[PDB]
Amino acid sequence: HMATGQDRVVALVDMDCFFVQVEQRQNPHLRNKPCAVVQYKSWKGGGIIAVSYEARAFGVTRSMWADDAKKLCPDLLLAQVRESRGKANLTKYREASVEVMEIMSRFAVIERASIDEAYVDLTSAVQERLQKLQGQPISADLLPSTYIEGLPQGKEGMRKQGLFQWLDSLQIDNLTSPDLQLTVGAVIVEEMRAAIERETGFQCSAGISHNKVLAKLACGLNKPNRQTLVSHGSVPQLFSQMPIRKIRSLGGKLGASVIEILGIEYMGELTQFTESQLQSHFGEKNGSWLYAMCRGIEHDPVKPRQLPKTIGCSKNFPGKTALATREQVQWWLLQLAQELEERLTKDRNDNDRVATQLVVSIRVQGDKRLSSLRRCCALTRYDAHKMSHDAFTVIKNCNTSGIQTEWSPPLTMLFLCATKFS
DNA sequence: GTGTGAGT
């Protein structure tokens, strides 16, 4: 149960090349063809953020210029993100995301984790399904696209063989058997994904396991329109060669410290250290967390749908682009406040609350820190012009140039945020 | 109130 961290059934659903599929739903002509989506069109045709699987076979990857990508995929077609106030506009994608989320919310409550993925806690649905099943076996036909991680031992054929070996050894009578709960959870996810495709046409992948970390890791294991079930017994093999920085929450300084201090590279190697050793090197909390996590145990619950605590937006101006004149800072503050007003207005329309505070943050050229300073003021009226003047008033004192004709030092970031909701 | 980390 809880001792072995097998108390819940959690799943993660992530859309395959989400932006590409959204383009395919609205503009048919790009469908079933190698394509990509670029961001900025003049420098080099734009950075690539979403690539179709057909094009991935040719070696094309994201974070590389469109013209440089045409090198190995001459058939490659390009689609562009609309631009607004100098930054990307994702309304189309966010609305499609909402569509999918609403369809998923029918089977169970979800936790939106990004623009194209969300976690689902199926524990209750699994109980209901185990009752309604009434002891009938689970045939492989109920899982047409499910992969069992770690099997077979000793491509569609491999999937079916692993599924047969998994199903033939499952407990039938012990209704609290972790493996049985996962199998039923995968059945429910098969239904959920079938419904999602039927009503929207989108394809996706999913991961099924006992916690968020394993569900996420499992989702990307068998990438396009496939789902992976990760049992507690399969964790050791899966972790044997799993990069530490690939585990949710260990991708930053903590993970790097673990690698550096213990001289290891893969998650599976942490199993050899004692809990006291992990606590003596990383602290009580991180030590216990690592000790349980390397054994497949994690407890963050899938928290329910929530109202945002803040609404904000920002923009970066690197190098040459650094804001030097007063006109520039005034104009960009105004642009930000107009986007803010648009969002605050929709927010107030949908949730009957008004933000009472405006937080202003900036970054000065030459400073390594994320923000040079942050200040706040009352946000009484949802008027972009007023907010722009208030933000300017708090940031104007910073200007060190007694000339008053320019900004010295320049600003490399502007951030506006509404909070203290009611 | 700052720092960290996930996800784009």
Add this chain to the structure above:
DNA sequence: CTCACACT
């Protein structure tokens, strides 16, 4: 870019 939270 956008956001949340743990710290403290």
